[PDB]
Amino acid sequence: TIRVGINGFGRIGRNFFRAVLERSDDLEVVAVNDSKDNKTLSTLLKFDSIMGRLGQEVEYDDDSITVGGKRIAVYAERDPKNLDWAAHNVDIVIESTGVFTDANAAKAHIEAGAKKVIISAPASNEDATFVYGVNHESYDPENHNVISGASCTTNCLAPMAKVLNDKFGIENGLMTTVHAYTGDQRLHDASHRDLRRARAAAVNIVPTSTGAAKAVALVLPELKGKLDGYALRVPVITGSATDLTFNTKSEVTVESINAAIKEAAVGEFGETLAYSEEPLVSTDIVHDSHGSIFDAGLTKVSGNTVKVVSWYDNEWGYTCQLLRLTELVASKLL
Amino acid sequence: TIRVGINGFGRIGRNFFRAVLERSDDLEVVAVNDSKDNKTLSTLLKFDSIMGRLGQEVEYDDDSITVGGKRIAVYAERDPKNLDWAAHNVDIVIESTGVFTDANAAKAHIEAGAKKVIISAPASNEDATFVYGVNHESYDPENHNVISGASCTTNCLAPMAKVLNDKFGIENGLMTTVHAYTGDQRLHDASHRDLRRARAAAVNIVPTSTGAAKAVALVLPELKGKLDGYALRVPVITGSATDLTFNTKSEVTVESINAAIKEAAVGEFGETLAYSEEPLVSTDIVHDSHGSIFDAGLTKVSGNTVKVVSWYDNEWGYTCQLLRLTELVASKLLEH
Amino acid sequence: TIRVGINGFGRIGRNFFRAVLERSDDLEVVAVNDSKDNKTLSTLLKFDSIMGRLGQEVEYDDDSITVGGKRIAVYAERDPKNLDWAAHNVDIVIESTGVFTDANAAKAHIEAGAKKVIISAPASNEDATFVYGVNHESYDPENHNVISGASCTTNCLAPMAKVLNDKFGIENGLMTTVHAYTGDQRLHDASHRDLRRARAAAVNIVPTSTGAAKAVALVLPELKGKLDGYALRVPVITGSATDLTFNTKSEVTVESINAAIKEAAVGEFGETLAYSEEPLVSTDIVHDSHGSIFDAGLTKVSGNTVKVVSWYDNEWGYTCQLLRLTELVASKLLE
Amino acid sequence: TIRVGINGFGRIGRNFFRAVLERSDDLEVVAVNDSKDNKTLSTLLKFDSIMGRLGQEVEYDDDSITVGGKRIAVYAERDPKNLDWAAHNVDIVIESTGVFTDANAAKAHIEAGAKKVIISAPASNEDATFVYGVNHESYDPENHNVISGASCTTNCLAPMAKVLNDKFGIENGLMTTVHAYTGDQRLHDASHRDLRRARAAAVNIVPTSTGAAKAVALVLPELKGKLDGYALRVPVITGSATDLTFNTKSEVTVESINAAIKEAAVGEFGETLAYSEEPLVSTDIVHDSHGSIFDAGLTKVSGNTVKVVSWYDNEWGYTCQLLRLTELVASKLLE
Ligand SMILES: NC(=O)c1ccc[n+]([C@@H]2O[C@H](COP(=O)([O-])OP(=O)(O)OC[C@H]3O[C@@H](n4cnc5c(N)ncnc54)[C@H](OP(=O)(O)O)[C@@H]3O)[C@@H](O)[C@H]2O)c1
Ligand SMILES: NC(=O)c1ccc[n+]([C@@H]2O[C@H](COP(=O)([O-])OP(=O)(O)OC[C@H]3O[C@@H](n4cnc5c(N)ncnc54)[C@H](OP(=O)(O)O)[C@@H]3O)[C@@H](O)[C@H]2O)c1
Ligand SMILES: NC(=O)c1ccc[n+]([C@@H]2O[C@H](COP(=O)([O-])OP(=O)(O)OC[C@H]3O[C@@H](n4cnc5c(N)ncnc54)[C@H](OP(=O)(O)O)[C@@H]3O)[C@@H](O)[C@H]2O)c1
Ligand SMILES: NC(=O)c1ccc[n+]([C@@H]2O[C@H](COP(=O)([O-])OP(=O)(O)OC[C@H]3O[C@@H](n4cnc5c(N)ncnc54)[C@H](OP(=O)(O)O)[C@@H]3O)[C@@H](O)[C@H]2O)c1
């Protein structure tokens, strides 16, 4: 058993906890740090507006929750430096607060006794950034200690980008992600540093910067400076699509583009990238464990320009990717 | 002109600003305090997801906005004791932050040079609480200085409860308000004191307590102890209905219940309480200026048990009620 | 196994299909009639915006779908007198089109070779109406051949009204159900015989008439004349709540009201009616198998006036009740 | 005054009715044909889930509605051959039913006494297709009698495309339109010829095809064969964006792309194409009169590849383009 702690028991933190329970046989969450009190925190674990009721018994007290009869230690420190992960023999900490995406801050978990930190977002000053299935072979068990699992969008874009770059060569490309609203958007028109994300999320198409097409550079260095993009946040609670338009010197058809993805989407890579010819809408990919679900029916080719669209559950799909990377960290030296 | 200040430039603050421009010819908002920086504040004033664009030009600088060419002083003081309303010759302050509903706290506005404060919600320790059209005749210009305009729901329930109580006598009633989600609720399942309001607001029916039915007693003491209720928050952005089920000893029919409202919903009171026989849905009462829009088509009677239903725009309707109350205050003496 | 046919492969028909696969050990759906072509019908079985993907393989051809290797004959006859259930040895037909709730139309299934018809809605001219767990004991296998499983709302209201009526006595009560939009409503403001249901469903609170409180009287004749109500359709895709306000001559408290349901919600009956003290919102009762989930936190009392509130998944909850009714029918004489 | 009839009093028809009242001083709608009784029709005119209440008073009788004192004759003829527009001295008919986009059906309005038919959609067999601001100067009052006002998407894309093609030259481009759901989509998972449009509209992102990028060729022949695209329908009731990604041989920057739109979007053409540096979301362009609202903050450039985004109210914005076209027709020869 490799012992895991979660810092930030929000959407991704709670997704991750459920993923551990459902898909892991060698990881165990033993400690959680979060701003919520234990009554709220256990309630939100038990009941989920997206995932439904947890399949296990949940109780709490002043210092813990207990899930399927396993006591889990719970803290409420604003500052990671006041945690003690060593006290519980925690090896890996999932940093999913959204406020410690700077590795120089997330480093504090390691001072506090953790061996590894995996940031559940694009980071700064990180040892390394990973999309599982794309660049995880490059993980250095000795020197990669505070790492990033990238964004939901990057985990969708990169697997497909890699396949098509390897096969046909991408010269330039621009991305639009049409993406479920997230918790940092406001419910009613209200204060936000981003004036568009200020705006009532459930009744607006909300453009917002993404970053997660340039972040492909960190994971596919071949594509540095060749990809850019942005998001339109729209009123669905989870489920997103990445629409990539790109040029290639290759001679391509709809058919050959699609066949390139079909032939890659196999074996273990095929757990990251799926290939579909089904008449998909967003609800069909909710709770899909892939990082990227390629939609062959949406491929277009105009000369040397190609549009391709891949789906992703930005919550569960990303989390499943984050867990694959967590499994890789645990299987190697700590 | 009576000059007005707004503390808390949120949904209700901004509705109130627009209501003054559209509906008043004797009030002017000359100063605003809020948490936002001027870029964000002017932006959220210019653009509204519910109300659409402001029909006036908006500009901003380091300590003001300019709206239709009128300069409005803007502050970002989290503590109202750090404001000065007398500096801008402001008589009345709307207290719409939602964090100063204790009148002892809201009194800071009086010490900062305002003559009157109107709290845009239920209050504690207040001089007086009003639903316009129901009990505004009791307003005492000398002694009611920090006052409450009640809640959106109380402004919908009280007009209707008064009419039916006066005509038939209400023994006991219980209310459900089916209510647009509001800013207190969470977009995604996340931290909240209320474990239900914690839950993703736009995909859930969310039960939550109000106090709006017990608060009717403040404006109609005859109904002390006779009403209670709760809310179900549902995925519409604004627009709400209050569904009241009560017992009467009177012999009543659907027709006599409806006739009672129709009779009453006239003149100045009719600006607060409307009577409708139209096939209404919530979008039909968005931007309606009444506190209470009685839906005759929904009334039911089973023996001595009556169900009546009244709609309200919890933003705009409540705001129009608050503006009526503000106009009253502004028409009577304003001394320190 | 008893062989079942479905007429009307819509929300309820497809829920029913999935419920049979998941919850039944003695029933098999062998034949479906619907307006859709096989491609469309198979697509909507496999993919569901509410229930997610079906966990079985789905294939189709010119006059069948095949689900987890089981061939299912498919028809598209507007008029059921043009069907033939006997050719598939179908005993029970679930009548879920929404358009044949008059038993005088629905009985065409019997003429077409079925032995029993269960209508997925309030009916007219029917042999009997049932809410499972409330009055199914009155089922007459000889004379009850074209029956109704009543409405989603009645299946929520009736169990709770029964318990509270039995204990305290209901003088009169009025109901509001705050209810998920349904397929009868328009997406955009458009033609409808009901000028409120005409209005854009996903952005409106929409009042609409339900006969579901008065229909409790079919199932609990003690309450005839004593109940009425209406619905407010609101923008969630499934999941609903029935809010009942009634007066009683008994002296009652929030605790005694809650205790009466908790007491009752225990056995077989407890599969129909649950008692919850949880902080429920609508998403928490989506895919719940109960007819009625009583929310003890929402009980209020003022003098002799009582308000109680119960949740239901108007799709799956109702469907599980219909399945319970079907199992009872399947367990007795099919002459 | 030039008198106008509307055939198809749906979303676009009723938007058009309101646009005339709000924005025209020289047109009057004097007759309407739809599928509805006058109570139903008057209700849906008076009350709108998107546009709010009509400001004018609305009465009806067996033969008509009266709006602000003006009697408007109403018909419910399925087949336009059975109308008589000449009896109402109607010169121009708006064909907004959606079912007569073949000009050889639409021309029945002319047999029925009208002089001009404007189809509120892509058409077939038409005399001409127009995006106001782009190609309306080619309108020929003698020979252009059954015409198309193109699609919502085409009225957004073509103005932006013309400016950038004129300045920099577009070699090829692919577009994605992120589009409010429309009446054709289903509220619950249900029958549709499009297996994705079958899927509950207000909880799904729904890919669907549009010919709107190819149809730019009818209005800008230079761009024939160069553009294609598709749509993602999303849960907002109105308001859309068109995202075009294109290659040019020109040397361009974000700044130079944006500068080109800004210098074009002035004068009369600027009532069709607006230039914005505001932090726009979809609700900010609801009831916006422009065909195309270019969002300078979303422009991206990677080498010789450009992404530009333009907003449109697919209801009101399109309708305002249609009214511009109608005003032009009304201003020139009517036989
Ligand atoms: N949601 C997605 O689709 C998605 C996908 C991929 C990656 N991510 C990334 O994952 C991260 C979390 O996002 P999310 O959607 O899960 O947001 P979230 O629900 O807001 O989760 C953040 C959680 O951290 C807690 N928290 C905040 N500051 C804390 C502190 N100093 N110490 C301890 N706990 C603290 C919050 O408690 P309170 O709620 O009480 O403040 C909350 O439970 C972000 O970096 C986000 O970009 C999100
Ligand atoms: N339907 C309704 O919305 C409704 C109806 C009737 C009554 N009310 C009541 O009206 C009040 C406001 O509600 P709302 O919906 O307008 O909420 P809101 O949108 O959150 O408005 C609150 C505003 O006050 C600001 N604020 C918070 N603390 C402040 C402080 N210490 N000093 C200055 N500004 C501060 C907020 O800025 P930040 O956002 O930056 O914090 C925001 O602009 C509440 O009491 C509410 O119950 C609301
Ligand atoms: N919450 C609920 O939805 C709910 C709950 C309880 C009971 N019910 C009741 O169950 C019934 C079905 O409602 P629903 O929501 O399932 O509606 P629905 O989704 O529209 O289902 C009706 C189905 O029947 C098909 N159909 C219509 N006319 C037909 C005909 N003449 N022959 C064969 N098939 C025909 C329809 O095909 P097309 O789509 O091609 O017309 C559709 O697949 C109604 O009586 C309703 O009141 C519904
Ligand atoms: N909505 C948009 O965003 C948009 C934008 C640009 C262009 N358009 C185009 O405008 C047209 C109308 O679309 P819409 O959204 O307004 O659709 P809609 O709401 O369905 O309007 C069509 C109207 O025509 C009626 N109708 C149907 N067949 C008729 C007939 N034979 N004779 C008379 N009335 C008839 C319909 O009644 P029933 O409903 O009872 O059949 C309805 O009132 C379509 O060609 C569409 O592509 C739509």
Oligomer: homotetramer
* Total beta-strand segments of chain A: 17
Q: Which sequence of SSEs, written as H and E, runs from N to C of chain A?
A: EHEHEEEEHHEEEHEEEEHEEEEH
Q: What proportion of the residues of chain A form beta strands (DSSP E)? A: 25-35%
- In helices, the fraction of residues of chain A equals 10-25%
Number of helices of chain A: 7
Largest interface, counted by CB within 8 Å of the partner chain's CB? B-C, 48 and 48 residues
Global geometry of chain A: globular
Rounded to an integer in angstroms, the radius of gyration calculated over CA atoms of chain A is 20 Å
CATH architecture of the largest domain in chain A: 2-Layer Sandwich
CATH class of the largest domain in chain A: Alpha Beta
Number of domains of chain A: 2
Notes on the protein architecture:
The PDB classes it as structural protein. The entry lists the keywords Dehydrogenase, structural protein. The structure is a homotetramer. By secondary structure, the first copy, chain A, is an alpha/beta fold. Helix content of chain A is 22%, strand content 26%. In chain A, the strands form two sheets. The first copy, chain A, has a nine-stranded mixed β-sheet, with helices on one face. In chain A, a hairpin with a 3-residue loop joins strand 3 and strand 4. Chain A starts with a strand and ends with a helix. Chains B and C meet through strand 10, strand 12, strand 13 and strand 17 of B and strand 10, strand 12, strand 13 and strand 17 of C.
